[PDB]
Every structure is written in C-alpha cells, then in structure tokens.
Amino acid sequence: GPLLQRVGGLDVVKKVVELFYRKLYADPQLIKYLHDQDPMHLRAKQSMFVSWLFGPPNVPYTGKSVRIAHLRIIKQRGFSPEDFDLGMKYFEEAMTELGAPEVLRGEVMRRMLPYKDAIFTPAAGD
Ligand code: HEM
Ligand SMILES: [C-]#N
C-alpha cells in the first residue's frame, strides 16, 4: 500500500535522510556548499519535502520554491546540475544501503527528478 509502509516505516526514512546527509558532507565537491551549513538545521529545513516525498502519491508539493532555497549557492558558489546529480546518487545509495528494493527506489527517485529542473531553470523573480 502506502510508500511509507513499503520502505519500512518512519524509522527507515529517518535513517535514509541521515545517511544521505552523511554522504553529502563527506563529498569533496559538495562540501564547498555545505561546510558553513549546520547539518541539523538543513535536515530540519528539508523535512517538509521529505515528508511529502514518502507521503501519498500524486499530491503536488507546495512548500518553498527549491530554486529560491538553493539560489545563494548557485549564484555565489556555482552549485550546478552535476552537483544535484551527485546528491540524487547519494539519496539512492542511502535507500539501497538500508535495504529498500529497486522498484521502491525508482518510484521515490522519479518523484524527486522534477526538482532538478525546478532548482536550475531561471524564472522571473530570481
Ligand atoms: C546535492 C547537494 C545539495 C546541496 C549542496 C544542497 C544545499 C542546500 C542548502 C544550502 C539549502 C539551504 C536553503 C535555505 O536554508 O534557505 C537547501 C535547502 C533545500 N534543499 Fe538542498 N542541496 C542539495 C541537494 C538537494 C536535493 C537532492 C534535494 C532533493 C529534492 C534538495 C532539496 C532541498 C529542500 C527541500 C530544501 C529546503 C527548502 C525549504 O526551506 O523548504 N536539495 N539545500
Ligand atoms: C538539501 N538538503
């Protein structure tokens, strides 16, 4: 049934996100963007998105614009689509390492994929 149960419940989601952030901060290309970001604060800010991500299907995300959220590191530090790809690799690795099957991982990653274009497509108002 629901994605949250299928992946193994809220304890698994928590550990996926924590492993995701461990991988992020250990990466020498992404640390440029994170060394001055409190990892606990960042996870807190990302929580609404993660709650939507493992929530009911089809519901559109209505939280803060992800381009706006990342626009400082884009303009000031060159955060690029290739850095976002690495982030998505690490989120997928975290799900794999905690035992989530590929069919579940593909479902989750397909929900996340549109947010690459969201972050990096210029919009009036930047
Ligand atoms: C790959 C390396 C990544 C870096 C360096 C990074 C960096 C950041 C930073 C610095 C913020 C802080 C924005 C703020 O506090 O105003 C943020 C917020 C956020 N990022 Fe990322 N990010 C990465 C990948 C991702 C990925 C893969 C996603 C998946 C969708 C994502 C989704 C979000 C969300 C939802 C927020 C919170 C927006 C809000 O405040 O509601 N980020 N990110
Ligand atoms: C992005 N955390």
UniProtKB/TrEMBL annotation:
Residues that hold heme b according to the record: K64, H70, R72
The protein's name: Globin
Organism: Chlamydomonas reinhardtii (Chlamydomonas smithii)
Transmembrane spans: none
Record's subunit section: Homodimer.
